Design an enzyme around this catalytic site. Structure first.
Site, mmCIF file in Angstrom:
data_model
loop_
_atom_site.group_PDB
_atom_site.id
_atom_site.type_symbol
_atom_site.label_atom_id
_atom_site.label_comp_id
_atom_site.label_asym_id
_atom_site.label_seq_id
_atom_site.Cartn_x
_atom_site.Cartn_y
_atom_site.Cartn_z
ATOM 1 N N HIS B 41 0.807 -1.215 0.000
ATOM 2 C CA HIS B 41 0.000 0.000 0.000
ATOM 3 C C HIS B 41 0.854 1.286 0.000
ATOM 4 C CE1 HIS B 41 0.048 1.193 4.299
ATOM 5 N NE2 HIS B 41 -0.283 -0.044 4.670
ATOM 6 N N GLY B 135 2.445 6.010 10.596
ATOM 7 C CA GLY B 135 3.861 5.838 10.297
ATOM 8 C C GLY B 135 4.432 4.506 10.768
ATOM 9 N N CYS B 137 3.343 1.468 9.898
ATOM 10 C CA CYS B 137 3.182 0.429 8.868
ATOM 11 C C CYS B 137 4.535 -0.093 8.417
ATOM 12 C CB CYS B 137 2.358 0.934 7.683
ATOM 13 S SG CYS B 137 0.614 1.276 8.066
#
Ligand SMILES: O=C(Cc1cccc(Cl)c1)Nc1cncc2ncccc12
Ligand SMILES: [Cl-]
Lengths: 305, 297
Positions: B41, B135, B137
């Site tokens: 993503h 942040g 991820c």
């Protein structure tokens, strides 16, 4: 979202752990530059522990009596000195993995990460707090002496604790990195018992603000309290007195949530009186006191849910 | 003595964390040999979105050094960025897929910099109760077995209830989740029975025996009761796995099941077990044995 008991990443500390052997005793040491720091009781027998004269035991030792092992490499000891309850072993090799560091002495209520080690090898990392009675509720087995406590705010490691002993109740005692014990403890097998422990009030308040930030307000009420009336009630539940310094320290979290410190104190007073009634706060059925106001600001978001 | 929620030492994983930027998105990547693994993503039909990107669109930063991306490919929900430099700090590692009930360490990162380490478990509903902000991820979950790091989780998203969802390192999601903004909710969760039993054995080892009784139950009767309190069924495999702890304490698994039954129907009565007023289910039988023996890495 979420609120976990979080420890600092342990890598910078793992690269400093060594094994120290003296006679039949093996424990851990902290290798920073060309010095290995470890508990001075490594020179004792179990018999010596009743009334050890460390100065007399140390004078009989030579550099080659101390075996230091860093991974699979033997370090050569070239000098030794005692500073309070810590032995400082001068070695011929500086640790290439020495991080930026400081030795800091903490106060009760302060939190820190512990890297538990056995035979100079790290096995685990956990977060804990210096209790008001100067003990820590750790997880340590035989061979864990010399394991260290630290914080890593920014890129500098602040060493604050070195493990020395377990007390009869299962709690742990030790020193700062200058060898000064936290509390009235001695590195002697004498009748020593931890004093009656109390709850770290400023930390419970901080954790109640963390719950409000994460969206939970069921415990709040319309009441306020004076600081004196709050302390009269809190002392009855074995809670530490809340000082004006603690109130000042909670200022930022009070401004972020819009709940005055003495209004959050009124909610705490009510929680102590009523219990949780089958409810939880941040996934806990007890009031948590091992998160400081600084830990809450570090872990929680800046936007209140 | 003592019983803490303990994480594995994170050093071997810290040396693999990098920052990945693509357009306006910045998240974390795992740098192993000459490949950087991160949630796909970051490119936000993922193949159509990916074909439009060139190697120079992906900015990878390891500390203060910019890594040059020389190739890219997708494997399920993970993006694999081929870089021109192999990580000199690559540890011995494996990619393993864990089962619900299994525990692991999470090294939470922001901007490719590790900020914390905590222990958690894969819930029966395949979510994790973690602690992550925007942040985070690309942060990874792992276990250490001897000197080998077993990577088992990569963080992808937060669900509306505050719980977390992610994939194994091959990009396969844990749970019926997809990597996109849509109506997704965690299913009804259950308690990991074998883990609660292991934690009751850890309490007995540490000197907490008030909950022990003279009674024993059948496996069938225990499961009939446990299903009523939203507890996962206990299998004969779980009973076999609890064998070592049963032999060490002298309390048969079905004997400890009878104590757990009484705790479910009567509560704790103002008492605690290992400093907890709730029955703890995020310690496996192996975690209890490891912490009550001191295995090192
Ligand atoms: O307590 C000691 C050694 C000791 C004895 C007497 C005085 C001093 Cl300063 C030190 N070692 C341990 C530390 N932590 C945890 C333990 N758990 C079990 C056994 C031993 C442990
Ligand atoms: Cl302090």
């Amino acid at each position: 979202s979420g609120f976990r008991k979080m420890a600092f990443p342990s890598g910078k500390v793992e690269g400093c752990m060594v094994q120290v052997t003296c006679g039949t005793t093996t424990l851990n040491g902290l290798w920073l530059d060309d010095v290995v720091y470890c508990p001075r009781h490594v020179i004792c027998t179990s018999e010596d522990m009743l009334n050890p004269n460390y100065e007399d035991l140390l004078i009989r030792k030579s550099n080659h009596n101390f075996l230091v092992q860093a991974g699979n490499v033997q370090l050569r000891v070239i000098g030794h000195s005692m500073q309070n309850c810590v032995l400082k072993l001068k070695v011929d090799t500086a640790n290439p993995k020495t991080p930026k560091y400081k030795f800091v002495r903490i106060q009760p209520g302060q939190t820190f990460s512990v890297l538990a080690c056995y035979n100079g090898s790290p096995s685990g990392v956990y977060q804990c707090a210096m209790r008001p009675n100067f003990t820590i509720k750790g997880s340590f087995l035989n061979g864990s002496c010399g394991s260290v406590g630290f914080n890593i705010d920014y890129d500098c490691v602040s060493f604050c604790y070195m493990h020395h002993m377990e007390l009869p109740t299962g709690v742990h005692a030790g020193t700062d990195l200058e060898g000064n014990f936290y509390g009235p403890f001695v590195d002697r097998q004498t009748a020593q018992a931890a004093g009656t422990d109390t709850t770290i009030t400023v930390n419970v308040l901080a954790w109640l603000y963390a719950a409000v930030i994460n969206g939970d307000r069921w415990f709040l009420n319309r009441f306020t309290t004076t600081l004196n009336d709050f302390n009269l009630v809190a002392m009855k539940y074995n809670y530490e007195p809340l000082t004006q310094d603690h109130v000042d320290i909670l200022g930022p979290l009070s401004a972020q949530t819009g709940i005055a410190v003495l209004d959050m104190c009124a909610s705490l007073k009510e929680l102590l009186q009523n219990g949780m009634n089958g409810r939880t706060i941040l996934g806990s059925a007890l009031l948590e006191d091992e998160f400081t106001p600084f830990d809450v600001v570090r872990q929680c978001s800046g936007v209140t849910f």
